[PDB]
Amino acid sequence: MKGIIFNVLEDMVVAQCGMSVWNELLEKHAPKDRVYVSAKSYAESELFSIVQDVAQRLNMPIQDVVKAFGQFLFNGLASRHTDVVDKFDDFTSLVMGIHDVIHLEVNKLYHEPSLPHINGQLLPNNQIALRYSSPRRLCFCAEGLLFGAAQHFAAAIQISHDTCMHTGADHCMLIIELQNDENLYFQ
């Protein structure tokens, strides 16, 4: 798990809960003097432990917190990699380019990142079938990231997530419905 994910998580915790809370989390869940260098890889268990601790403090379902993080994360990533996001003029383009364009670039920017496998298929009625696969099972982070992307393009979406690795499949299916964006009028 790259430092950049931890750095965006810090911004979130610091913004919502305060710096004193982040330092608690970090002292408790990370080795002494840990510093997350944005480009370096770190044990994903440190990220999961921090986020689980937050979920418990807030008495929220863990996957609801991961999803909220995901949505915060989209802007954290777009603002730190603005040249990658500015390759797309709308939400649907970006989603269709996650694998072959965005995460292709992430392999040139970072040494050996740990990324999901994603394939998007355009459906009728302004829907997208996004297939997600990862041993890290962060499909709810992916839901949040899609909601973040929607907000980035002033779009409105809904997601159905009825095949899921957490319910025993070897992939998740996220069926994205684009309800509105700047190029959608009546239908």
Stretch 83-122 residues interacting with ligand MNH (CB under 6 A): 84-85, 98, 102-103, 106, 110, 113-116
What binding mask, one character per residue, do residues 164-183 give for Na ion by CB under 5 A, x or -? ----------------x---
Numbered residues of the known binding site for heme b: 2, 103, 114, 132, 134, 136
Dihedral (CA of 126, 99, 130, 142) sign:
negative
138-154 per-residue burial string, b: 16 or more CB within 10 A, e: under 16: bbbbbbbbbbbbbebbe
Q: And the tokens for 147?
A: 């909601």
Strands (E) in 35-126, as ranges, are 117-123
Q: Which of 96, 92, 108 is nearest to 180 (CA)?
A: 92
With contacts defined by CB under 6 A, name the span among 53-61, 145-153, 160-168, 177-185 that binds ligand MNH.
145-153
Closest approach of Cβ 143 to ligand MNH, in Å? 8
Those residues with Cβ within 8 angstroms of residue 32's Cβ, 6 or more apart along the chain or in another chain? none
Asked whether position 4 contacts ligand MNH by CB under 6 A, the answer is yes
Interface residue list for ligand MNH (CB under 6 A): 1-2, 4-5, 74, 77-78, 81, 84-85, 98, 102-103, 106, 110, 113-116, 134, 136, 138, 141-142, 145-146, 149
